[PDB]
Structure formats: C-alpha cells, structure tokens
C-alpha cells in the first residue's frame, strides 16, 4: 500500500460523526498542516484536514461503513461516492 494521493476515496472520521464518505481533494485554497490531507465530504460537500489515522480506504472499508444512516447528508453522500466520486460538486 501507498500514501494517499488526490482523488483517493475514503471514509473520513471526525469527532462526533460516523465514518463519512469522502475523497482526498487537490490542494489547488488553504493548505493542510504537515501529514494531513484536505478532505471533501460527500453529501454535505464540506472540507476538513485530517491525518491518515482518520482515513479509511473506500473499497476495503465500505462493507463496514457504507451502510445507510439516518444522519442528514449521509445517504446523499453514499450516492455521490458510488455514482460520481470525481465530479465537481462546486
């Protein structure tokens, strides 16, 4: 396995939220601190900076975290990561 690179699909964990469908974004923009990545969250289309310890590869982990939730924006995010993970959501 290799380091995360822009375009990689993941589940991303933030304090007080379930593991969320997301992608490593291109920094093309506020630049992350050392060894953290810019993360675009599907569904809510928000951004944050997370280190690998909160980043879970999509296809390994989707059986675990890819099940629908009742949380606002989550199911929308499953749709996005499954149907057009590399589109512009701007």
């Amino acid at each position: 396995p290799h380091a995360f690179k822009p375009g990689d699909l993941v589940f991303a964990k933030m304090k007080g939220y379930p593991h969320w469908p997301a992608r490593i974004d291109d920094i093309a923009a506020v630049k992350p601190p050392p060894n953290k990545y810019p993360i675009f969250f599907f569904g809510t289309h928000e951004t944050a900076f997370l280190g690998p310890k909160d980043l879970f590869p999509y296809d390994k982990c989707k059986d675990k975290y890819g099940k629908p939730n009742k949380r606002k924006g989550f199911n929308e995010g499953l749709w996005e990561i499954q149907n057009n993970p590399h589109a512009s959501y701007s």
């Binding site: 923009a29 506020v30 969250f41 809510t44 289309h45 928000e46 951004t47």
Partner: peptide, 5 residues
C-alpha cells in the same frame, strides 16, 4: 472550501 466545524 466550506470548512466543516
């Protein structure tokens, strides 16, 4: 960028 709180 719309930063998540």
């Amino acid at each position: 960028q719309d930063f998540k709180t």
